[PDB]
Amino acid sequence: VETFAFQAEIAQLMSLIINTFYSNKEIFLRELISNSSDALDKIRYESLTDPSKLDSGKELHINLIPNKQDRTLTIVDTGIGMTKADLINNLGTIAKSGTKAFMEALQAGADISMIGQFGVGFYSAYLVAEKVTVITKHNDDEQYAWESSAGGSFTVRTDTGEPMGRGTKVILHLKEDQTEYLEERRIKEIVKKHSQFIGYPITLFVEK
Numbered sequence: 001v002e003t004f005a006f007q008a009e010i011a012q013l014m015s016l017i018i019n020t021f022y023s024n025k026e027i028f029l030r031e032l033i034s035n036s037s038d039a040l041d042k043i044r045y046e047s048l049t050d051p052s053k054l055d056s057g058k059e060l061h062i063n064l065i066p067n068k069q070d071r072t073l074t075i076v077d078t079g080i081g082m083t084k085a086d087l088i089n090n091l092g093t094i095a096k097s098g099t100k101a102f103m104e105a106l107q108a109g110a111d112i113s114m115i116g117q118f119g120v121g122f123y124s125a126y127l128v129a130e131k132v133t134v135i136t137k138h139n140d141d142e143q144y145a146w147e148s149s150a151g152g153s154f155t156v157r158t159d160t161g162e163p164m165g166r167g168t169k170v171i172l173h174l175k176e177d178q179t180e181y182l183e184e185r186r187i188k189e190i191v192k193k194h195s196q197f198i199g200y201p202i203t204l205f206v207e208k
């Protein structure tokens with residue numbers, strides 16, 4: 001397990017998201033599903049010139065898995081997944097420009113629901129989550145586990161749990177006062193009003 005510091009701009013963005021009073025928190029799910037949809041676009045597009053990239057799984061879908069007892073909401077896709085370089089450097093590098101630009105806008109008057117147009121929608125997960133775990137598998141790399149409870153640091157480590165084949169699992173350890181996002185009626189309402197035009201099956205896993 002390696003520990004890394006966030007870039008100052010990203011760390012600043014996370015502090016803002018965690019400690020700003022913002023009631024329209026449900027937008028986190030639209031942003032995470034948009035991330036999955038982009039990941040699925042990319043693997044499908046690349047498979048058009050190299051069909052062997054789908055040997056790790058041909059189905060392209062998004063699963064939403066709430067867990068009331070663990071107080072976790074998990075978003076699973078079979079998209080392209082992320083490499084070690086993605087998790088530690090490349091995505092952060094791209095995010096720096098959008099993050100800084102996003103924090104300017106937050107002072108021009110723009111509100112938090114706009115985070116998506118800056119390419120940094122993933123970090124909206126910290127509106128509802130005290131800790132975020134990302135399990136991801138790219139065709140050209142091993143399975144890795146990313147985790148952060150904000151505070152300016154994050155960890156990456158090789159994962160040894162069950163293999164995923166290919167794709168990304170985002171595990172939101174929900175805050176105490178945010179368990180409404182574990183209710184199936186609530187999840188269905190958010191999906192239908194923010195993400196009804198996603199080009200892949202979105203499946204809600206009902207708890208038994």
Ligand SMILES: CC1(C)CC(=O)c2c(C(F)(F)F)nn(-c3ccc(C(N)=O)c(N[C@H]4CC[C@H](O)CC4)c3)c2C1
Pocket residue numbers: 032035036037038039042077079080081082086087088091092094095119120121122123134146168
């Ligand atoms: C690396 C992170 C842990 C922290 C991060 O900063 C970040 C960001 C960023 F804010 F930079 F935009 N985005 N982001 C993230 C999170 C889930 C996914 C998905 N569900 O696959 C994702 N998709 C691909 C889509 C196609 C791209 O070619 C590569 C990514 C990206 C993360 C996860």
